[PDB]
Structure 1
Amino acid sequence: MAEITFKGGPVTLVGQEVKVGDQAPDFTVLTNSLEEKSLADMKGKVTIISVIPSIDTGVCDAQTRRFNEEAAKLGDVNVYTISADLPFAQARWCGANGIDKVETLSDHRDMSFGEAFGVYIKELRLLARSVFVLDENGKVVYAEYVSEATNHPNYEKPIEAAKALVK
């Protein structure tokens, strides 16, 4: 189990902690454009996934935006962000920042993602801050679950996993 804290005590997760080498669960989220997208689409490249609770929190910036730049520096990767937040809030955050290498997505709807990857925090109904990397087979190449929901992963980590495979 990933057992995340919420700044003073533990909080339960739905789902299980996934690992490297495992086949990713394969679900659907909405695009920020209000269409279904699933892991089956994402396997078209080595893909990084950046889970955050909602996009407005400022700490989300340090992920989605840095990921945009780092993905440009890699030159050949694919990256998405997923929130329990509105598709249009997510689209807008991208538009404000001029993001192009990353696209934001909304699990908001059916939580299928947050549930299956064990990042829906049961006790909050909120997505964890976590990251994953996925091979073109849809195998997990890296996974990390920030032990503290009030803190965020380092984007360098899934970059180092993805950059090893895009060569």
Structure 2
Amino acid sequence: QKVTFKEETYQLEGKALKVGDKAPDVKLVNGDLQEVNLLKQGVRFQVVSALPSLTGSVCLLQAKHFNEQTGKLPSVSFSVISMDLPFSQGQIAGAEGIKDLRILSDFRYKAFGENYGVLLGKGSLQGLLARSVFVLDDKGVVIYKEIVQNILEEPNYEALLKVLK
């Protein structure tokens, strides 16, 4: 699969993760500069979304939409991942009041990008994460995957909420 950004077409780098595959656990860094494991034990659904940067308008709308679901669906674990340092993630989350959302940084190991196959290849956005959504079931198996073809588009929220119902 390819991703488009205006005139640029990106190859996706890292390991291809498919619907039906066991999702790999990866090390990320949270707002307190604490290393955390992506996967949560004993929750019905885990939603893991990635975006190029929280600095961007489309990116912030995605973060705002997952912050709202965090409160509406407490039985579902929501995580948003970017290559932004935890400091900027905390600053932007603070200003926008997105305090319930689990915001994690892939900067240290690029372990999410490499293991979920959403690392953007050569181009202006190279090394940033493709806009993407994975839903895992209670076994940690991928039951839904969207890598957004046009990175200027928001994720398909309707397709996603049908998976969580």
Fold conserved between structures, TM > 0.5: yes
In the other structure, the counterpart of 1:32 is 31
| Cα separation, partners in 2 of 1:20 and 1:101, compared to 1, 3 Å | farther
Map Cα deviations across residues 105-142 of structure 1 (whole Å, 9 max, x no partner): 00012111111111001211111111111123221121
Could you say what secondary structure the match of 2:103 adopts?
strand
Output the aligned Cα RMSD: 1.8
Residue 108 of structure 1 corresponds to which residue in structure 2?
107
| Deviation by residue 1:44-99 (Cα, 9 ceiling, x = unmatched) | 42211110111111111211111121332234221110001110111122222222
Q: Which moved more, 1:69-78 or 1:123-132?
A: 69-78
The CA distance in 2 between the partners of 1:139 and 1:50, in whole Å, is: 15
Distance 1:44 1:36, change over 3 A: farther
Aligned-pair identity in percent equals 42
The size of the alignment, in residue pairs, is 161
Q: TM-score, normalised by structure 2?
A: 0.87
Return the alpha-carbon distance in structure 2 between the equivalents of residues 101 and 158 of structure 1. Answer: 19
For structure 2, list consecutive stretches of 5 or more residues without a partner in the other structure. Answer: none
The 5-angstrom pairing of residues 1-167 of structure 1 reads 2-40=1-39, 42-45=40-43, 46-123=45-122, 124-161=126-163, 163-164=164-165
| TM-score where L is the length of structure 1 | 0.86
Which secondary structure state, in structure 2, belongs to the residue aligned with residue 72 of structure 1? helix
Q: 5+ unaligned residues in a row in structure 1: which ranges?
A: none
CA distance 1:148–1:43, change in 2 (3 Å)? farther
Q: 2:117 and 2:34 mapped to 1: Cα distance? A: 23
- The offset of 1:102, in angstroms, is 1.4
**CA distance in 1 between partners of 2:157 and 2:94 (Å):** 21
| C-alpha separation in 2, matches of 1:108 and 1:141 | 26
Task: Give the AA of the match of 1:104.
Answer: I
Aligned structure 1 segments of 4 or more residues deviating by more than 4 angstroms = none
